[PDB]
Design a binder for these strands. Structure first.
Lengths: 141, 131, 38, 176
RNA sequence: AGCCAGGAUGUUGGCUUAGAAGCAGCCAUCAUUUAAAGAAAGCGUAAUAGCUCACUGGUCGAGUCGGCCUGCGCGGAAGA
């Protein structure tokens, strides 16, 4: 991934391909061939989860050489995964949705902490914990 | 910043840890970006953790006030961009010529780092490491 | 130029000057904030 | 007043004449002279030049700081010489020089020929660019303003005489 | 106050998810990483981005910033 002239952060849908009213010309204004991106990403969908708002970090080079950097889905949508309650903020502090624990959430935090940018893996889960009541969730303790 | 002791609570915290430490270096970034700090303290994130210091307080009487407490000869390091690299674990530890890689790595000039106390020398490459 | 009786800084970049006994407002960012009087 | 306290340092060879309030500077590029306001005490007294408020004048330190930065850029002009760089962006715009006369073609029905004052040396590196040099910082800004005043940088296609460093802010056509 | 640097990582934050991507309207506004950087300050975009900005380093070297109460002034102020 090069510097920012065509550098974007994208991928509303991971399990769904080419969401043109979500993304469409969000990178098509930069004009990158996303047809080489998707079937490559279908070969990047060999191992992990499906049908989820998983983001991406895309920068291309000068001569159509393309590059994606995907990560784990955001901590605001990590609450909908390990808990099974696909809702969020709206107005979160008086929105009651549900509650799972630090010991339930940490199973998918066993993988993503190296995928995230930190050295404290006990505190990169706290990037979901303070996100939780910012998306209307409680944490079991 | 706050009042007098709050300006100097880190200056009495400057030398409390290098009272049991002995060696350090110099880093600065007049071009490098946050991914330098995010990953060269991930270098600290694999060495010890957080408090491998990258503090930038070499103002003309700020670290110079913290200088006569410990390692008296570093009063001439008062001019332009200097950050003190505090490391305890290991006599002549890992972070000794990985700064020489950092001359190439992403922080294009590292403020002409050279290393000050206990090689008993200025400029001389730091290569005699007890691993 | 908005002539007024009460000029005020609207942009962050708006500046108050006092050319020739008249109080102007000059905004380098926006030309619609160019005001004078008062 | 910070600029009034910081003195200017005259380099080698640059002459200084102080017969009261008239100040004459002779240098390598040329010879500038400037009479100051009657509220400053400029004291050579050394190599360098310091500036002080004369007695009684309420804006003494106000007139002092403008006395410095005048004579500061005055001693820069006789040594290095100031350069203004202009640019003719726009289709079918030409610039050329014939001595002290700049010939411009800015899409009018007649050519505009601006005659430079004594002290300006304009040349054209290309046909769409004006670079001119001179001693006095004031007088090359004034003649750069006059060349910009012929055809200002309109805010739609950016056409017009502009400064080389000057940024221009464009708009869009309304809706259709 | 300039000047030389960083200004990010989670995270399009679920959402009005048609998208608002730190930048319309919701409500949160916590955590990584810290020298510090705001799920964001404004500009600019259909949507990004660009761009600076707070914040945070270096230099330089001293006062500086914003309210309050008042004295006297300025604009507001065009007619046969």
């Amino acid at each position: 991934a090069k510097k920012v002239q065509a550098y974007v952060k994208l991928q509303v849908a991971a399990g769904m391909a080419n969401p043109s009213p979500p993304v469409g010309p969000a990178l098509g204004q930069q004009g990158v061939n996303i047809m080489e991106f998707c079937k490559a990403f279908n070969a990047k969908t060999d191992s992990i989860e499906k049908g989820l708002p998983i983001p991406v970090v895309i920068t291309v080079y000068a001569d159509r050489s393309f590059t994606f950097v995907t990560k784990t889905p955001p901590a605001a949508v990590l609450l909908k995964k390990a808990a099974g309650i696909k809702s969020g903020s709206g107005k979160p502090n008086k929105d009651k949705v549900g509650k799972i624990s630090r010991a339930q959430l940490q199973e998918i935090a066993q993988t993503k902490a190296a995928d995230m940018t930190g050295a404290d893996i006990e505190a990169m889960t706290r990037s979901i914990e303070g996100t939780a009541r910012s998306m209307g969730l409680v944490v079991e303790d | 910043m706050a009042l007098n002791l709050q300006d100097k609570q880190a200056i009495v915290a400057e030398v409390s840890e290098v009272a049991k430490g002995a060696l350090s270096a110099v880093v600065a970034d007049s071009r490098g970006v946050t991914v330098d700090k995010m990953t060269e303290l991930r270098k600290a994130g694999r060495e010890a953790g957080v408090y491998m210091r990258v503090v930038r307080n070499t103002l003309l009487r700020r670290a110079v006030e913290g200088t006569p407490f410990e390692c008296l000869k570093d009063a001439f390091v008062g001019p332009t961009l200097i950050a003190y690299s505090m490391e305890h674990p290991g006599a002549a530890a890992r972070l000794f010529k990985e700064f020489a890689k950092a001359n190439a790595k992403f922080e294009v000039k590292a403020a002409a780092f050279e290393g000050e106390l206990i090689p008993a020398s200025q400029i001389d490459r730091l290569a005699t490491l007890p691993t | 130029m908005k002539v007024r009786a009460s000029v005020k800084k609207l942009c962050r970049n708006c500046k108050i000057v006092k050319r020739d006994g008249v109080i102007r407002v000059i905004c380098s960012a926006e030309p619609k904030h160019k005001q004078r009087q008062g | 007043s910070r600029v009034a306290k910081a003195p200017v340092v005259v380099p080698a060879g640059v002459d200084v004449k102080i017969n009261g309030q008239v100040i004459t500077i002779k240098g390598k590029n040329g010879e500038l002279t400037r009479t100051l306001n009657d509220a400053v005490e400029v004291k050579h007294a050394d190599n360098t030049l310091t500036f002080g408020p004369r007695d009684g004048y309420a804006d003494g330190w106000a007139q002092a700081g403008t006395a410095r930065a005048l004579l500061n850029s005055m001693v820069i002009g006789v040594t290095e010489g100031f350069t203004k760089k202009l640019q003719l962006v726009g289709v079918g715009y030409r610039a050329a020089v014939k001595g002290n006369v700049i010939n411009l073609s800015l899409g009018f029905s007649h050519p505009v020929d601006h005659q430079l004052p004594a002290g300006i040396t304009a040349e054209c590196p290309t046909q769409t660019e004006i670079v001119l040099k001179g001693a006095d910082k004031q007088v090359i800004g004034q003649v750069a303003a006059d060349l910009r005043a012929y055809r200002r940088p309109e805010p739609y296609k950016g056409k017009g005489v502009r400064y080389a460093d000057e940024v221009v802010r464009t708009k869009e056509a309304k809706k259709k």
